[PDB]
Amino acid sequence: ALWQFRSLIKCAIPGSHPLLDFNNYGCYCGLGGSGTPVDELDRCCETHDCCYRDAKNLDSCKFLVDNPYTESYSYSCSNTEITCNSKNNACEAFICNCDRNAAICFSKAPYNKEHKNLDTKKYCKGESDKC
Ligand SMILES: [Ca+2]
Ligand SMILES: [Ca+2]
Ligand SMILES: [Cl-]
Structure with missing residues (x-):
């Protein structure tokens, strides 16, 4: 579930605010996206x-x-470390893992505040590079 994904981000990056920080960033950080990613975090x-x-x-x-976005799964956070409950069904388990991989990728990527709230119409028009 979307709110759960944001919880995963808070877990891996306690020093952040998932919504204000990782939403409306670059061309892909937020609901969907288009164009060519602006940077590493954007690639995540x-x-x-x-x-x-x-x-x-x-x-x-x-x-x-x-x-x-609405499928709920079971997860737990432990000292910056995320764990997707092995009791989630295969679909739920894949979704949780997607979010987990994302959150970890975010935590590793450098944060470039000038990429925030870009004009998707003048920086992101076009198709995705992969998928
Ligand atoms: Ca997106
Ligand atoms: Ca569920
Ligand atoms: Cl598609």
Whole structure:
């Protein structure tokens, strides 16, 4: 679930505010995206979206017609470390892992505040590079 993803971000990056910080950043950090990623953190967000695309192609997820953004899963946070409950079903487990990979990628990527709230219409028009 989207709110859970943001919780994962807070876990890996306690020093941040998932919404104000990682939403409306670059061309892909936020709901969907387009164009060419502006930087490493932006690439993390692009990758994340493609992860959700892959999820929808999983057998289990297909049958569930599950929506990555609203599908809830079980996770726990421990000292900056994220854990996706092994009891989540295969689809839920793939979605949680997508979010987990994203959160970790964010934590490693440098944050460039000038990439915040870019004009998608004058910096992101076009198609994604991958997926
Ligand atoms: Ca996005
Ligand atoms: Ca669920
Ligand atoms: Cl598509």
